[PDB]
Design an enzyme around this catalytic site. Structure first.
Site, PDB file in Angstrom:
ATOM      1  N   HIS A  61      43.746  43.707  44.505  1.00 38.17           N
ATOM      2  CA  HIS A  61      42.760  43.549  45.559  1.00 38.17           C
ATOM      3  C   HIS A  61      43.577  44.010  46.935  1.00 38.17           C
ATOM      4  CE1 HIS A  61      41.887  39.924  42.770  1.00 38.17           C
ATOM      5  NE2 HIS A  61      40.804  40.585  42.634  1.00 38.17           N
ATOM      6  N   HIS A  91      49.178  40.656  53.995  1.00 38.17           N
ATOM      7  CA  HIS A  91      48.663  41.881  53.164  1.00 38.17           C
ATOM      8  C   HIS A  91      47.810  42.321  54.200  1.00 38.17           C
ATOM      9  CE1 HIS A  91      46.028  38.312  53.048  1.00 38.17           C
ATOM     10  NE2 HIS A  91      44.945  39.285  53.120  1.00 38.17           N
ATOM     11  N   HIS A  93      43.834  44.719  54.789  1.00 35.99           N
ATOM     12  CA  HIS A  93      42.481  45.070  54.479  1.00 35.99           C
ATOM     13  C   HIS A  93      42.152  46.462  54.900  1.00 35.99           C
ATOM     14  CE1 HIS A  93      41.725  41.164  52.925  1.00 35.99           C
ATOM     15  NE2 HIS A  93      42.378  40.814  54.079  1.00 35.99           N
ATOM     16  N   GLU A 103      38.234  43.225  58.611  1.00 39.64           N
ATOM     17  CA  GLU A 103      37.119  42.253  58.368  1.00 39.64           C
ATOM     18  C   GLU A 103      36.661  41.702  59.341  1.00 39.64           C
ATOM     19  OE1 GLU A 103      39.682  40.021  55.520  1.00 39.64           O
ATOM     20  OE2 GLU A 103      38.251  40.938  53.929  1.00 39.64           O
ATOM     21  N   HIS A 116      47.042  40.462  57.805  1.00 39.90           N
ATOM     22  CA  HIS A 116      46.909  38.997  57.618  1.00 39.90           C
ATOM     23  C   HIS A 116      48.008  38.511  57.373  1.00 39.90           C
ATOM     24  CE1 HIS A 116      42.068  39.187  56.950  1.00 39.90           C
ATOM     25  NE2 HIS A 116      42.588  39.518  58.145  1.00 39.90           N
ATOM     26  N   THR A 195      39.125  35.018  53.186  1.00 36.80           N
ATOM     27  CA  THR A 195      38.086  35.912  52.957  1.00 36.80           C
ATOM     28  C   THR A 195      38.069  36.894  51.489  1.00 36.80           C
ATOM     29  OG1 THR A 195      39.491  37.726  53.787  1.00 36.80           O
ATOM     30  CG2 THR A 195      38.465  36.888  55.567  1.00 36.80           C
ATOM     31  N   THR A 196      38.757  36.249  50.718  1.00 31.23           N
ATOM     32  CA  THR A 196      38.507  36.525  49.423  1.00 31.23           C
ATOM     33  C   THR A 196      38.250  35.347  48.533  1.00 31.23           C
ATOM     34  OG1 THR A 196      40.986  36.476  48.775  1.00 31.23           O
ATOM     35  CG2 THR A 196      39.876  38.759  49.444  1.00 31.23           C
TER      36      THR A 196
HETATM   37  N1  RZ7 Z   1      42.420  37.518  53.516  1.00 33.26           N
HETATM   38  S1  RZ7 Z   1      42.815  36.010  54.117  1.00 33.26           S
HETATM   39  O1  RZ7 Z   1      41.780  35.029  54.352  1.00 33.26           O
HETATM   40  O2  RZ7 Z   1      44.056  36.181  54.835  1.00 33.26           O
HETATM   41  C1  RZ7 Z   1      43.463  35.352  52.552  1.00 33.26           C
HETATM   42  C2  RZ7 Z   1      44.735  34.524  52.327  1.00 33.26           C
HETATM   43  C3  RZ7 Z   1      45.257  34.039  51.313  1.00 33.26           C
HETATM   44  C4  RZ7 Z   1      44.688  33.864  50.258  1.00 33.26           C
HETATM   45  C5  RZ7 Z   1      45.186  33.293  48.995  1.00 33.26           C
HETATM   46  O3  RZ7 Z   1      46.165  32.731  48.951  1.00 33.26           O
HETATM   47  N2  RZ7 Z   1      44.536  33.420  47.921  1.00 33.26           N
HETATM   48  C6  RZ7 Z   1      44.896  32.566  46.512  1.00 33.26           C
HETATM   49  C7  RZ7 Z   1      44.293  31.616  46.549  1.00 33.26           C
HETATM   50  F1  RZ7 Z   1      44.531  30.611  47.450  1.00 33.26           F
HETATM   51  F2  RZ7 Z   1      42.932  31.607  46.502  1.00 33.26           F
HETATM   52  C8  RZ7 Z   1      44.856  30.530  45.348  1.00 33.26           C
HETATM   53  F3  RZ7 Z   1      44.691  31.449  44.209  1.00 33.26           F
HETATM   54  F4  RZ7 Z   1      46.364  30.714  45.450  1.00 33.26           F
HETATM   55  C9  RZ7 Z   1      44.798  29.181  45.475  1.00 33.26           C
HETATM   56  F5  RZ7 Z   1      45.709  28.519  45.968  1.00 33.26           F
HETATM   57  F6  RZ7 Z   1      43.496  28.783  46.141  1.00 33.26           F
HETATM   58  C10 RZ7 Z   1      44.240  28.696  44.186  1.00 33.26           C
HETATM   59  F7  RZ7 Z   1      43.124  29.675  43.978  1.00 33.26           F
HETATM   60  F8  RZ7 Z   1      45.405  28.744  43.371  1.00 33.26           F
HETATM   61  C11 RZ7 Z   1      43.762  27.326  44.214  1.00 33.26           C
HETATM   62  F9  RZ7 Z   1      42.479  27.220  44.292  1.00 33.26           F
HETATM   63  F10 RZ7 Z   1      44.297  26.422  44.860  1.00 33.26           F
HETATM   64  F11 RZ7 Z   1      43.663  26.743  42.723  1.00 33.26           F
HETATM   65  C12 RZ7 Z   1      43.211  34.483  49.961  1.00 33.26           C
HETATM   66  C13 RZ7 Z   1      42.651  34.976  51.332  1.00 33.26           C
HETATM   67 ZN    ZN Z   2      43.337  38.849  54.221  1.00 32.48          ZN
END
Ligand code: RZ7
Ligand code: ZN
EC number: 4.2.1.1
Length: 257
Positions: A61, A91, A93, A103, A116, A195-196
Site C-alpha cells: 500500500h 510513510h 501517500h 490525503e 505521515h 486513513t487505511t
Molecule cells: N495513513 S495513517 O492514517 O497515517 C495510518 C497510520 C498507521 C496505520 C496502521 O498502523 N495500520 C495497521 C493497523 F493498525 F491497522 C494494524 F494492523 F496494525 C492494527 F493494529 F489495527 C491491527 F489492524 F493490527 C488491529 F486492528 F489492531 F488488529 C494505518 C493508517
Molecule cells: Zn498515512
C-alpha cells in the site's frame, strides 16, 4: 482485500469496514477560513534526537520506515496532546502526477504527496492497545510540493529500488527523520481516524501548515514502486491516497493566529 484500484479502492472499503462511514473519518479538507485559532493550544514538541530507524518495508500500500519504539526514544508531545506518543513508523501517500497525492487538502488544494509520522500513546503500553482508544494515536501530517529537492529525503528514495514489490524490506538504520520537517511547526488539529483499513477512529491529527519541497526526480522514484508482489503483473504504486471525508460534527483548530 482492499487497495486503491477501481475494484477495491476507497469507495468499496465500507463493505468490509463499515466505520468507513463513521463520525470521525480521515482525511478531511481543511477550510482555512473556518478553522479557528485556539490560543489554548500548548506548544508542539517534536523530540527526535534519539530516533532509531531499523527497517523499510513495502507493504503493498505504501512503504513504511520503521523505528525502534520499544522505549521512549523519538516522541511527540504537547500541541493538543496529553502525554507521550512514541514514533513507530512513517510513510507517504502520493499521486500519479503532481496535481494530486495528498490525503488532507487545504481549501480543496491537493498536494503532490503527504508524509505521515505515526505515534502511539504510551499510556496504553503497546500499539495494538493504543489503536482501540480515541486518544491512542497522533499522526503528524506534512504536505509535499514539487520544486527543489529535499536533502533529507534522498536516503529514502535511494533505497526504493531494493523494495520494489510488496513484502520486500531492507535494513534502514540511522535515518534522521528531523530532515523531513519543514521550518515552521504551525499546525491544524482535529480528531480523526487511520486513513487505511481498518480505519479505526483513534487518531489525533496534527497537520503542518508549511509544506516541504521535494524534487520531480524524487517523487518520480516513489512512482516506480509496485503495489504487486515479485513476478506478478506490474501495477505501479501511485494514487495510494484516500479522498477527503465528511467533517460532520468536528472542529479544526489552528495553532497560529
Ligand atoms: N495513513 S495513517 O492514517 O497515517 C495510518 C497510520 C498507521 C496505520 C496502521 O498502523 N495500520 C495497521 C493497523 F493498525 F491497522 C494494524 F494492523 F496494525 C492494527 F493494529 F489495527 C491491527 F489492524 F493490527 C488491529 F486492528 F489492531 F488488529 C494505518 C493508517
Ligand atoms: Zn498515512
Amino acid at each position: 482485500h482492499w487497495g486503491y484500484g477501481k475494484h477495491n479502492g476507497p469507495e468499496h472499503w465500507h463493505k468490509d469496514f463499515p466505520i468507513a462511514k463513521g463520525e470521525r473519518q480521515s482525511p478531511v479538507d481543511i477550510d482555512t477560513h473556518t478553522a479557528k485559532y485556539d490560543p489554548s493550544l500548548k506548544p508542539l514538541s517534536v523530540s527526535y534526537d534519539q530516533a532509531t530507524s531499523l527497517r523499510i518495508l513495502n507493504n503493498g500500500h505504501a512503504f513504511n520506515v520503521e523505528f525502534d519504539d520499544s522505549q521512549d526514544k523519538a516522541v511527540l508531545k504537547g500541541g493538543p496532546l496529553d502525554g507521550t506518543y512514541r514514533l513507530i513508523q512513517f510513510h507517504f501517500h502520493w499521486g500519479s502526477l503532481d496535481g494530486q497525492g495528498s490525503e488532507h487538502t487545504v481549501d480543496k488544494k491537493k498536494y503532490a504527496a503527504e508524509l505521515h509520522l505515526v505515534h502511539w500513546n504510551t499510556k496504553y503500553g503497546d500499539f495494538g492497545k493504543a489503536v482501540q482508544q480515541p486518544d491512542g494515536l497522533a499522526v503528524l501530517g506534512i504536505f509535499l510540493k514539487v520544486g527543489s529537492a529535499k536533502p533529507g529525503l534522498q536516503k529514502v528514495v535511494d533505497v526504493l529500488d531494493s523494495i520494489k514489490t510488496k513484502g520486500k524490506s531492507a535494513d534502514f538504520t540511522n535515518f534522521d527523520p528531523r530532515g523531513l520537517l519543514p521550518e515552521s511547526l504551525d499546525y491544524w488539529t482535529y480528531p480523526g481516524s487511520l486513513t487505511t483499513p481498518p480505519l479505526l477512529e483513534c487518531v489525533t491529527w496534527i497537520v503542518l501548515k508549511e509544506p516541504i519541497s521535494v524534487s520531480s526526480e524524487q517523487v518520480l522514484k516513489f512512482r516506480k514502486l509496485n503495489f504487486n508482489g515479485e513476478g506478478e503483473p506490474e501495477e505501479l504504486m501511485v494514487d495510494n491516497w484516500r479522498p477527503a471525508q465528511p467533517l460532520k460534527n468536528r472542529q479544526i483548530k489552528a495553532s497560529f493566529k
